[PDB]
Structures are given as C-alpha cells and as structure tokens.
Design an enzyme around this catalytic site. Sequence first.
Site, PDB file in Angstrom:
ATOM      1  N   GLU A  30      -7.704   4.942  -3.634  1.00  0.00           N
ATOM      2  CA  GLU A  30      -7.038   3.760  -4.256  1.00  0.00           C
ATOM      3  C   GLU A  30      -5.482   4.142  -3.967  1.00  0.00           C
ATOM      4  O   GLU A  30      -4.712   3.743  -4.011  1.00  0.00           O
ATOM      5  CB  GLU A  30      -7.805   3.002  -5.378  1.00  0.00           C
ATOM      6  CG  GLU A  30      -9.414   2.990  -5.014  1.00  0.00           C
ATOM      7  CD  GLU A  30      -9.148   1.502  -3.779  1.00  0.00           C
ATOM      8  OE1 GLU A  30      -8.367   0.721  -4.100  1.00  0.00           O
ATOM      9  OE2 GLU A  30      -9.919   1.692  -3.604  1.00  0.00           O
ATOM     10  N   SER A  31      -5.708   5.109  -5.076  1.00  0.00           N
ATOM     11  CA  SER A  31      -4.233   5.821  -5.690  1.00  0.00           C
ATOM     12  C   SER A  31      -3.572   6.849  -5.974  1.00  0.00           C
ATOM     13  O   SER A  31      -2.362   7.184  -5.501  1.00  0.00           O
ATOM     14  CB  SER A  31      -3.913   5.269  -7.282  1.00  0.00           C
ATOM     15  OG  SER A  31      -2.550   5.467  -7.611  1.00  0.00           O
TER      16      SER A  31
END
Lengths: 1223, 26
Positions: A30-31
């Site tokens: 995700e990040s």
Amino acid sequence: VPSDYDGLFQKAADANGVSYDLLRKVAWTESRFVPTAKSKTGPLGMMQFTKATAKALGLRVTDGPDDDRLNPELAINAAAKQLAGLVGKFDGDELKAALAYNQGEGRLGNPQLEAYSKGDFASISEEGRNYMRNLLDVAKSPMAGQLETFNSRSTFFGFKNAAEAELSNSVAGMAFRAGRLDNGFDVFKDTITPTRWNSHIWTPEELEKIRTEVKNPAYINVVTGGSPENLDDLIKLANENFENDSRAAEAGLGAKLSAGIIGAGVDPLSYVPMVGVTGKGFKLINKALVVGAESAALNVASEGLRTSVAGGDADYAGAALGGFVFGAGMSAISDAVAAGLKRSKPEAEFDNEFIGPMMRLEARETARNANSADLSRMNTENMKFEGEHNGVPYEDLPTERGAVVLHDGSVLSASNPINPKTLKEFSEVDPEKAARGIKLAGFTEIGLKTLGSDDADIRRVAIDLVRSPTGMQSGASGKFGATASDIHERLHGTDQRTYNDLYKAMSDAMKDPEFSTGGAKMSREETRYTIYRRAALAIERPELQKALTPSERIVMDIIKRHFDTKRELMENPAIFGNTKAVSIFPESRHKGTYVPHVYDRHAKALMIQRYGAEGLQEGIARSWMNSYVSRPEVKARVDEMLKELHGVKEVTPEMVEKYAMDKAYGISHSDQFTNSSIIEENIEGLVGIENNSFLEARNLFDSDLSITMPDGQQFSVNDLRDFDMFRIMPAYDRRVNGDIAIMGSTGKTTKELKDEILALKAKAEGDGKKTGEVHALMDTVKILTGRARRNQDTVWETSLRAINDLGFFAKNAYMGAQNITEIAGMIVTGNVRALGHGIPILRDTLYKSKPVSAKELKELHASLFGKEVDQLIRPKRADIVQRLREATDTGPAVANIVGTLKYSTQELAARSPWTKLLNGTTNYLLDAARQGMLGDVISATLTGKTTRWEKEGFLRGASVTPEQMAGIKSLIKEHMVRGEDGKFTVKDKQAFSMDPRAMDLWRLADKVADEAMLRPHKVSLQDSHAFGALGKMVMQFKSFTIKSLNSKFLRTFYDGYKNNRAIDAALSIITSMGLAGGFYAMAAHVKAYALPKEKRKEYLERALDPTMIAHAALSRSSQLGAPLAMVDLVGGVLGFESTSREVMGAMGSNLLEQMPSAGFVANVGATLMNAAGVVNSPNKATEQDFMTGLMNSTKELVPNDPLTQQLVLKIYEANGVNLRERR
Amino acid sequence: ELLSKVWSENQKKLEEKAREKALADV
C-alpha cells in the site's frame, strides 16, 4: 528489511489477532513504508485509506483528525482490526480478506469476492489478482494452490533457476517446480494453538466452583480430545481423570519402576507422556543391589527421611522418580549419540557422563529403602585421601572426570553441587563475581583475638559480644547472658525454620487454581507478590482476612506470627540474659503487627515524574491525615505521641499536620526507607550500622486510605510500599536480629556500641595489636548487624558440611541428601551438554575454551554491563513492571482517554501469546533480552553510533518521546565511562539510579526488547544478526524453544493433552539454567582477557568446562517466582563458617531439658514460634532443619513433577548432547 | 493441483523423449 514500524505492526497483530506478515506486507504494497503518502486518488496514510474507512467504525467518540491525519499507531491498529475482522469473516482465508481489503466491498468488491468464492479468478480484477499473488507467501488460504495454478528458492541440485526449471526432468526438477516456499509459519497458529481453557482467566464465581469441586486442580490444565463445552464438564472430566490416575498409580509407572530403573535397562525415551504420574508409589528397591537388609534401623535417627515439612517422602519421591527418568533417558541419549558419532569415526570411545551417577544413584536409593548395604560405596583401601575443601577429605578418581570419593566410600560425581573438588575449583576460577564476602573473619577467630587479653574494655565488649569456644581463661562466671553471637545464631536458626515454614505455605498457596489452572493471569513472581501483599494487607486490616483462601490464610498466619515475635523481641530484649536491655523497638503503644514499611524506589520515581517533590510529600502526608481523622485509634495514639513530644496537654491540628509533613519528607526527599540494597552493600566506616531503616520507617498513621492528587487520581501510601517478603522479610530480619543481638548482649544500642568502639579505636590508635583487635571487634559488629554478605557459595559448602555430618550420624537422611544433590547435578550437567550442543553462540564462542575476538570481547563487555545496569535500574516490584508493560498498549490508553467505563489494565492488555502461553520462559527471555538491549544502547551511545531503536516508530512503541530519548543519551553520556578497552563502568552508581531519566532508559530497553525480540512468533538468523552477544544468545534460546515446541514428542504431547503449563515449566527450567551458564561463560571470557596472555589458555580451559558451567548454573539460576531465596532456606550463620570434661558438662546440661519443644511432638506444617520458643531454641541448627531446608531449596532446582522431567528429557533428546571425548 | 500439473508436464516431456529414443532404435 526493517522499516521502523515493526513494533507497531507486532502489537497491532497480537491485539486483534491477525498475521503479522499479512499486515506488514499490506504496508509493503500500500505505502512502501511512508506515513503520509501522496496519492492522486486522495487516500494518504500508512495503510493508504481515506475512502470512508477512517471515521468508519474507528472513531466519532474522540477528537479525530481522520481523513486529514491519522496517528500511526491508531492507523495501524484500526487497519489491523479491519483485517482481523475480514480474515475471521472469511473463515481463515487471508487471501479473500486481502482481496476485500484492497478492492473494498460492495461497489466492486463483492462481485470479485464471489468470483473468488467460486474459483473463477478470471473474473477477479487484474490489480486484485496481482495483489493476492504478491500476498501468496504471507497469506494462508485454501485457494492458494488454485491461484498458483491460474525463483529465490535454494537450488536442489545444479545451478539456480534455469537449470532446474527449463530442464531437470528428473524428480528433483519436479520437486523444485512444485515447491512454493511459505515464509508464513506462526508458532502459535500452527504449533501451539490457544484452546478455550488456556488463556481463559477465571471469574470469581468460576474460581470458587473450581476450588470447591476440583480435587486436584492441575487436572484442569489437560484437555484431551474435544474441549468440554462448559466449566461443569471440565470439572467432571478433571475429577474422573484424577480418580482414574490415583487408582492407576498402584500398578502405574511408579510401581513398575520401583524395581530396577537402570539395572533393568529401562529406556524412558520410548515412553508415553506419563501425564497422570506423580511420584507416589515409587520406592526404588531394586532386587539385587540389596545384599544386606536389616529391618530395624540402627538409631532413632536415620530410620526415615528427617524432613520436617508435611508431604515429605512424597515430593521427594516425585523428585526422585523424575530424576531417575531423566538420568536414564540422558544415559540412553548419550549412548545413542556416541553410536551416531562412531558411525563417522569408529575410533572414538566417548563418555556417557550419566550412567555412572545413575547406577550409583540406583544403588544408593535401593540401600536407603532397603535400609542396608549401599553397594555404590567404593572400596577405600589404598586411598590416602588428602585434599580438604572445608575439612572434608576426598580422593580424586582417575576413572571418572572430577568425581571424588568421600571418607566412607561415598563417591560424589562431578557437577554434584556439594562435592569438594568442584566447590574448590569453582572458588579458584570464578569469573568476576568473587568478592570480599565474609572471608574477613569469623566469630571463633575474633573470640581468640579479642577475648584474649590486654584491656579491660576490649575484653568487656568481647565478653558481651563473642563467646569463646575453648579458652585458657574459661570463666566460671564470665557471663550469665546469651552474648551477641549466641543471640545471632539463635535468631538465624528460628528465622530459617520459619522461612522453611513460609516456603511450604507459599508453595501451597500459589499452587491454587487462581494462578495455576486457567490462562496465565500473572508471572510466577507476580503471583508471589500478590499473595504476599494479600497476607500483609490482611495483617494490617483484619477485615480482609475473610477474603483469603485457607492457604493464603496459613501464609498470613505465618507472616503475622513471625513479625509479632520479632516485635516482641525488640520490645523486650531483656528476655535474654541482660536485664538492662530496653525496647529497641521504635514506637511502642502502637499495639499491632508491624509489617515493615519499605517503599519502592520506582513507585516514588513515578510519583515524582508528576508531582515532583512537594507533591509526593503532600500526598503522603495527606493520606496519613486521612487515616488520622478517619480512625479514632490513630488519632488517639498520634495525639499521645505529640503530647509527649511537645509537652503540651492539647494537640492542635497544625501540630499533627507538621508531624505528618516531617515524616513524609523522609520518604519523598530521601531514599533511606527505599529498597536501597546497594548502599547496604558498602561496608566501610560503620556509618550505616546506626540508623536501622526498617524501624525508622515506622509511623503511627495508616498508609491505607487514599488521597486524590491535584489531577484527581487517587494515591495512598500503601501504593508506595514494597511487599513480597522475598527481599523484605529477610532484610528486615537481618537488621533487627543485629539490633536485638546488640541490645540483648550489651545493655547499649547499636549507636552506643558503635561510638564506644570508635572511642576504643581512637584510644588505641598507637598499638598495632590493639588496632587489630578493635578491627576484629568492628568485624563482629558488621557480622551481627548483617553488613557482612555471605554470597551464594555458602549454600553448597554449608550443604557439604551438613551432609558429611549426616553421613556420620543420620544414614537415611544422608543418602537422601546425596540422592537429591546427585539428581540436581545430573539435571544441570544434562542441561549444559544439550544447550552447548544446540545454541550456536554458546558452543561456537562461549562454551569453547579458545579466547574470543576483540570485537566479541567488546560485545561481552556491553552485555555484562547491560545486565549490571538492569540490576541497578530494574523496578523490584512485580506489579510495577507488569503494569508498566501492560499499560503502554493502545487499548488501555484509548479506554483511559475516551472510554466512559473504567475497565482495567490487564483486562484491555493485548499480551503476547508468549506471555499467555509459556509464561515462565517468556519472563526469562524478557529479562535477558532487556539486559542485552540496555548493553547495546549504552555501548552505541558511548561509542556515538545510532541504535536501530533511536528511530521514531520503536520509540512510539514505548512512551519514549523524541525528547526522552535525547535525555537517555545525555544520561548515558553523563554516568557511564567508556573504558580504554571495551570495559564499561558507572559514575557514582547511586546517583545514576537516582536520575529520573534512568526509568525512561529502562522502559525504552524493556519495551524495545519485548516488541523486537520476544513479541514476534518467528525466529530467523537475520533476527539474531541485529542484536549483541546477549541479544543473540537469547534469540537463539527463543529459536531453541520454537524448535522444541516443533519436536515430535512435544508436538504430540500438546495435541494429546494441550497442557501448556507443563511445557512452560520444562522450557522455563531449561532457559533459566542455560542463561545462567551463558552469563558464566561471558564473564569467564572477560576475566580471561583480564589475565595476561600466557595464562588465558590455561584459565579458560580450567574455568570453561561442563563441571564449572554446570555448577554456575545451579548456583546462579534465577528462579524468579521463588518464595524466599534459596540462600534463606539453607544458609550458614554469617560469623560461623567453621576433653571429656566439656563432654560430660554438655551431657549433664541437656539431661534436664523441659521446654515444650522437647515435651511436645512437633507441629505438622507450622512451628509458629513465639518469643518463648525463640528464646528456648538451641543455637545449633538441628538435622531436621537442615534436611527440610535442603529439600525446599532443591524443590526449585529439582522439579517434583516426573512429567516435566520427561518433557525436559525429550527436548534434550530432540536437541542432542555433546558426549565429551576420549577417556 | 500444482503437483499434478508439474508431474503431468514432466511425464509428457519424458514420454516424448522416450518415444524419440524408441523410434530411433527401430
């Protein structure tokens, strides 16, 4: 790989039980590990979600930045909760949960989730399919194979990848092509699953039902087959199992093994887990080995085992059966390993190292139970003996390494804790740990020096204090008094007897269902603290006594009687010879049991972190005033004291307020009444012998009532106090026994004697002979007051002397003591062998005799210094550490800030499965890992390097602000000295521990240790790489634990019975002994470098061998939750380390005895001596006292359960053993 | 499933090679 958020992910996984790998790789995708991520869509966060998830279900009760900002701990915790909900909602399928998390749900999610559900991965969107694919390794799913069908794998043969992929049509190519490395093993998900009845902490109603209706509560721990639906069925099943096992014992394993464990070649390795068996019907009479066999005992002594606690001969039988099983199994293990090694090298004999001791143990036990003709005894002909450690002669056997033989032919193996050769050599080569101790002088030597002559004063003080065993004076009327030495010896004896009574009572108390049966509520030392605190509070407030269970009631009765007797002896010290002895007790007319007021250093430190100095003083004073105004008895006694003090008929409230403030100043602005063992460790000058702290901590108020502090939170002085009578009752006893001896012998107080002795020194400053005599007298005062310090080593030397005496007189007790000591030696030597085999750092560097690298020496210096710093700064109260560890979790914080219902810390605590399951091993590993982290942080700070734990996320895992960490750096820079070599030293010691930032340092180290080292369920080599010597050692210990949990026997045992308690016992024993040995090895290598170059090889060879590492393990094993200390149960009198007319005098003297102890039969289970019993007690310790003390002290080292012995044995078998070499 | 597919592909390759060998021997 690590990216500063690992602790957060680990805690957010343990809370909201979910895969740590799943959450971490979700962060990956995700990040890629950024807290605020710039996305064109708009979601910005660690988990990359704004959407509606955020407010969602997470907040709207607290002031929330939300869509704009999220607290990284809160963001990770909320996302973890969402993932746990999805994973559970999709049964156990983590891949469908990941699809639901990535693709959302409803608008485009549910069609794709349904497509997943029907196979149909083509319908699933491309991005979701790739997301699932990149999560394939970490996520476990029934659909994993189907997704695989819809590469950094270690080559089976040949070259990597292409060679086995494009080619190798032969099996190995197939095996490689179907491999699919998992990287997703969770020890508590796969190996040890928390059942319903583990991890379930009882409610009070459940506790009462269990206490009333369960015969043996340990049967609650086993869950065979399907889990019972309700507690009533569990109770029924437990009772049925208990009756069945009690019936079966008559023909059970105890009876089968009662004849010939090793004469018959019994192999305990091929054995079912033998759960029900408690050694019981186990009297080892091996037919053959019984040559001669008198039915009548030779004396009234001998006969049976002379232990004085109830349940003796039964717990001894359990220890014996466990030791026999373990030793026979270890012999089998050693033989099998020798055969396996002979396969490689046929020309290598190897040594069993267990079968000699085991054969002799069988012979001894057989003769003990058959009453005659010990066949293990050697033929002592042509033996010159020579060589005495403490006046005990011995012959070294060439045949057996170490293993000397005693005067009667009794041969003590090496690693037997009492044999003189190992004790002597351990004294000669002991790593830094050898100290001054009590080697200065003893009462007998001081008597000769000072009662000798040359002064009227010196001889007067000597006659009052010391007694001459044999003297040319032989005073007919020298003194009709006890003398300080005799009082000291009598008080030591009575204290030791009541300590053994307390040990038995506390063991019974802390075996009850509240602490033993359900999910692990608290660590062992914390259960000990809770029981001691309950007893003390019930003593102070008698209305609490109706809340104690019968066992805690017995404990409280023992403690109350002890403290009442001590008070009675201080109040009337003329109960001994001296008539001008008066009330060394501080505040009489306060008629109630005085449990010593001792205040935790770190409780005061916390109450200074807020409300620095005047705040804590005002709180203490105001709680005392709450007591004063509330209770009329307190008001009466305080008013009487104030009237007497100020000579005024009436007392104004200003007077009592000023008195309370002055007395509270002593706690708030001084550390005199705290734990403060280190200042007592210093001996010079006789300054601290005056001013007993335990008596001055006495006040007329009650610390019971609480006052609300300016922030509204409640504080009572009882919150500061340290209970636990483990450091407290012994130290109180040392000081007050010294004071009682000084006043009962000399009419004067400790202060008056100190000043008079200083006056004698100042007078005879000229004479060297007189100066030496005055110094011997000062040494006597130091011994009496307890300044002294006997060290741990007095235990085994005292045991050796007493066992020699038993061999002269009490045959059966003699042989039982030999058997228990030999069992302890075999347990510890088997541990040393197995862990030297298994743990890599141990064998590779520390158990080897070869000197370590220079960098390894720096790491060892850091590790040992970290252990020292931990000892200085660790909170002593188990409550404080437990609440500190639990409270930092997000749940307690969120409930305290937002929640409208109070809840409780230890109710909202996440808690690792390592603590809930396998608690003891967990506590040992936390302690050692925290010490390692302390050493690493200190060494890096002094070196200037930046630790991996300086980073923001791990600091957020603790309550360490940016600023606090800088304060920790400054504190280390201020109080720690970087040596020329790797050696680490502290400045002022006391001042460092007094710094408030020391608590921040300790908290940082402890939370980092938990989060990084112990909290994860997975051990890897890369994990061991990061930490230092102690850190690597304990990570390899954690890996060893996980290996053992995956061993065939232990895995099968947990499948059959669950019963994590037994596995915890086994692994905790192993970890305790192994950490003791590792610390010994590190200190030995340090001391080797302390030596010059030529001597290092000889010293390391001499000091690093299985015998000495094993003796260190027995001597220094932690035994965290042990009621009282092993020194207390058996400890020699400090001063007392070592023709027919005097004979007949002693005879005609004891011919007359008519005290109740002689007239009456001894009480079963509790002496409960009063002042008359203490005064009438003999100064010499009776053989019953020594024997019961030995059994209680070895109850810690030698387990009473045969099952934990079998589990330890099978762990060792799965591990392996070294087998020595050659001879 | 993966084991079945792997063994099936391997068996196809092996049978191909064995058929080539047998036809060569004839």
